[PDB]
Symmetry: D3
C-alpha cells in the first residue's frame, strides 16, 4: 500500500512531520512529494526543500522525499500510489481540499484522498505563519525540525 | 501491514452515502468493521436488529466488511476489535467542526487509533440519514439515496 | 414572465427578518406565497391559526403576498401551487450550510423549482424566531424585532 | 425584469453556464457582465472573455454578454437591472458575497442580490482551479464549453 | 478603571476549559462574576446547588472570582450586578457564529455591556461540558478535562 | 491596564474607529499600532496611516497612535501592554485570529488576545473593500472618518 503526501513544504514544519509520521504508521510506503511551485515564489528552492525534508524525515524508514512539477494526479499514478494524504487545519483549507479531492477524483478515480488531523500542538501552524514570525525575528525553534530552523535563520540572515 | 479499520455510526438507516464511504474504506484497508451504535441518544427509527440486518444485506457484496453492533464507548470497542484506523466521512463544514472535536477526544482516549477522513461522492455530500427520514416521512421521494433493501424497509416502516 | 414564488417556513412567530425577506421577494416576483408549516417537529409556541393570522396582518400592506398553511412536503406543495421559485433568507454560515443541503434535496424532488437566496438587512441578520422567543421568555425586550401585532400576541402568550 | 450576472469569467466555465441558464429561466433578460479586472492580471483579455462567453451562451436567446470597468452598482443601474445574480460555492465566497451585497445595498438600495446554487456537478469548480489543472496539462474538457476549452489549450500551448 | 466582568453559562459541570477562561478574565479585570444559569432548557446533569458548589471549589484559588446563580435574562442580571464586560470563550466556528448572534442581541438589550471574547488553551479548545458528559456516560476517561472535585462528583453521579 | 490594537489600517475605517472606541471604554490606555507592512504594498505610507489615525482618534483622550516594524508580541511587551484587541468579522478572519493568538501565546504567554465585535453598521466593511469601491469611484463617505475620506479621494485623483 503506497501513499503520497504532497504539498509545497516551504519549509517542512513539525505539523508536516506529525502528518507524515501518522501516514507511515498506516501505509507501507509514503512518498512525501514536494511541488516545485515557481508561481508562488517559494522562499526555498525545490532542491533545498527536498534536502530539508529528507534530513527531517531520515529517522522514518518508509518515507521517500521527491520533487514534482507534474499534475498531482499524474504524479500519484506514476508513483503507483492509491492514497493521497492531506492534513486538516481550518475551514478555508477544508473547503479547498474538497475542491482538489473532487477534481482529483475526476482525473484519477482510484486515487483516494485521505485526511489526517495533526496534533493540537501544530493545529494553528503553517509554513507561511512560521516564515512571517521568523521574518520579524520571532523565535520559531519549537515549530520546526532542527535542520529546517537553521536553514530558515540562514536564509533570513 | 494488515490494517483493521472501524467505521462507526448509528446508520439509522444506512444510506448510499454510508455505502460510498465503506466501499472506499474496503479499497484501502484489509478489514473494515461497520460498527452500529446500539443505543443512540434519541430513539432510532429502526431498531438495532433492523439497522444491523439492513447494513449486512447492503454491504454483502464487500468481502472484507463485517457489520457489528456496539454499546461501549466507540474507542473502547475499537481497542477491543484491534482496529487502528477509525473511518469517518466529511460532507461539509458542520461535519468538519464536529469530527475534529471528536478526533481530539478519541486521540486522548485511544492514541493508537488513527482518525482517517474520507470524502463521499458529490452525489451523497448533502444527505444524512436524518434528512432522508424527514423527506420520506413528509412524502418525498428518497429512492435514489438508499440501497433497495433500505428503500423497502423504510416504506414498510412509514406505512404503519 | 409571470413568476410565482414560495417563501416557506414555520414563522413561529413571523419576525421583522421574515417581513424584510418577503418584502424583497414581492419586489422581484409577481406573486409570493408565504407558506406556513402546519406541524413542525417541536410543538410551536403559536398554533398554525395564530401563525397564519399574525403573518396575514403583518403582510396585509403587500398586495402580491398570499399567506397559506401547508402540511405536505414543501416541494409537493410548491408544485401544486405552480411555484417555480423557492425563496429562502441567508443570515450566516449555519444557514448557508443547511440551506445548500436542502436546496440539493429540493432540486432532486422538484427540478423545475429554482432555489433563490436573499440576504436580509444587517438589522435582522442575527435574529431568528427561536432567539426572539428565548429572549422574550427570559424577560428581554424584543419589540424592535417584531411587527406590532406579533409583539402584542407574544406578550399575551407569555403572560399566561 | 432585468438581471445582471457579473464576474471576471476568466474563462467562463460550465459552472457559470449552469448559473446563467438558471437565471434565464427566472428573468426576461439577463446581462452577463464581465469585469475588465486588470489588477488581477487575467489570463484572457476582456475582448477574449466577452467573445468566449458570447459563443458559450449563444444558444440562450435572452442573454446579453457585455464588458465593464465601472463600479458594479453603477453598471447595474445603467443596465436598468434590479437583480444581481451570484452563484454560491464555499463559505469564503458566501462571506465575501455578503460583504459585496451589503456594500451594493448602500450604493443602490433597489438592486436585489440573488444567490443561486449550481448543480452538484460544478459545485467544486472555479475558473482558477480549471486554469491550475490546465497549466499542468490535466484534462479539463468536462468543465468548460468546447470553444473555451480550445481557447484555454491554445493560450497555454 | 475598576471593571466588573460577568462570565455566564450553564457550567454543567464546570470544566478545565471554563477554568482556563475565568483565569484569563481574572488577569485582566478587577472582579469577575462566574454566573451560573439556574434553569437551562434541558434538565442539567447537576442541580444548580451542585454546579455552584463545584464552581466555587474549583475557582477558590482565584481571589477576584465570585460564583453566583442567576435566573433572569443574562443582560438583566449583568446590569443589576454593575458588570460592564461580558466574557465568553471562543473554541471554533460553531461558537463564533452563535456568540456573534448573542452579542448583537445583548448589545440591543444592554448597550453599555461590552462583549469580550477570549480563546482557551489548545488543550481545551475541542471540549464542552456536553462532550465530557457523553464520553463519561459511555465509559470514557475524562479526568484530564476536569478539576479534581468535578471528576469526583461526575463519577459519583454516573455510579447511581 | 494597557491594551494594544494592531493592524495595517490602510486606511483606518469607521469599523476600526468603532473597535478602538469600545477598547477605550474598557482599558485605561489604548495603543493603536500600525504595521509598516511593506510586503503588502499598502496604498498609504506608514507616516500617512499614522497621521490619518491620529486625526481620526484625536477626540479619544486615551488613544496613542504609533507605527511598528517589529514582531507584534515584542512590540506589545515593549509597550507594557498585556491585552491585544482584534475585531471579529468573518470566519476567515476568526480562523486567522486563532492562529495569531496561539502563536502570540507561545511568544508572550501573558499577552491576552481579546476579541471585540463591531457594530452591525461596520460588520461587512474592510479597508480593502472600501479601497476597491473607491478605485471604481463609488461613494465611501459613510465608511470613513472625514480626514481619511479626503486623503483617499486625493490619493486616487
Ligand atoms: C490533494 O492535493 C492536491 O491536489 N495537491 C495539488 C495542489 C498542491 O500542490 C501543488 C502546488 C503548486 C503546484 C503544483 C503542481 C506541480 C508543480 N509545481 N501540480 C498541480 N497539480 C494540481 N494542481 N497543481 C492544482 O493546483 C490542482 C490540482 C487538482 N492538481 C502542486 C497541493 C497538493
Ligand atoms: C468519531 O466517531 C465517534 O466518535 N463515534 C462515537 C459517537 C457516534 O456513535 C455513537 C452514537 C450513539 C452512541 C454511541 C455509544 C455506544 C452506543 N450505543 N458510544 C459512544 N462512544 C462515544 N460516544 N458514544 C460519544 O458520545 C462520544 C465519543 C467520543 N465516543 C456511539 C459516532 C461515532
Ligand atoms: C428550503 O425550504 C425547505 O426545504 N423547507 C421545508 C422544511 C421547512 O418547513 C417545514 C417545517 C416543518 C414541517 C414541514 C413539512 C410540512 C408540515 N407541517 N414539510 C416538509 N417538507 C420538507 N420537509 N418537511 C423536510 O423536513 C425537508 C424537506 C426537503 N422538505 C416543513 C423549511 C422550508
Ligand atoms: C455582487 O457582485 C459584485 O459586487 N461584484 C463586484 C466585484 C466583482 O467584479 C469585479 C471584479 C474586478 C473589478 C471590478 C470592477 C470593474 C472592473 N474592472 N468594479 C467593481 N465594482 C465593485 N467592485 N469592483 C468591488 O470590488 C466591490 C464592489 C461593491 N463594487 C468588478 C464581482 C461582482
Ligand atoms: C453571551 O451569553 C449569553 O447570552 N448568555 C445567555 C444564555 C446562556 O445562559 C443561559 C442558559 C440558560 C438559561 C439562561 C437564562 C437564566 C436562567 N436560568 N437567561 C437567559 N438570558 C438570555 N437567555 N437566557 C437566552 O436564551 C438568550 C439571551 C440573549 N439571554 C441563561 C449563556 C450566556
Ligand atoms: C493578533 O494580531 C497580530 O498578531 N498581528 C500581527 C499581524 C498583523 O500585523 C502586521 C501586518 C504586517 C506586518 C506586521 C509585522 C510588523 C511590520 N511591518 N509584525 C508581525 N508580527 C507578527 N507578524 N507580523 C505575523 O505575521 C504573525 C505574528 C504572530 N506576529 C504586522 C495583525 C496584528
Amino acid at each position: 500500500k503506497r501513499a503520497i503526501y504532497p504539498g509545497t513544504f516551504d519549509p517542512i514544519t513539525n505539523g508536516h512531520i506529525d502528518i507524515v509520521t501518522r501516514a507511515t504508521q498506516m501505509f507501507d510506503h509514503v512518498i512525501l512529494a514536494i511541488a516545485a511551485s515557481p508561481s508562488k515564489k517559494p522562499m526555498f528552492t525545490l532542491e533545498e526543500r527536498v534536502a530539508l525534508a529528507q534530513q527531517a524525515t531520515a529517522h522514518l524508514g518508509n518515507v521517500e522525499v521527491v520533487g514534482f512539477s507534474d499534475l498531482m494526479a499524474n504524479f500519484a499514478r506514476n508513483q503507483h500510489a492509491t492514497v493521497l494524504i492531506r492534513g486538516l487545519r481550518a475551514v478555508a483549507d477544508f473547503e479547498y481540499e474538497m475542491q482538489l479531492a473532487h477534481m482529483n477524483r475526476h482525473l484519477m478515480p482510484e486515487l483516494e484522498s485521505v485526511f489526517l488531523m495533526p496534533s493540537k500542538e501544530w493545529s494553528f501552524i503553517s509554513s507561511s505563519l512560521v516564515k512571517e514570525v521568523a521574518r520579524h525575528q520571532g523565535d520559531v525553534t519549537h515549530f520546526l525540525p532542527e535542520n529546517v530552523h537553521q536553514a530558515l535563520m540562514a536564509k533570513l540572515a
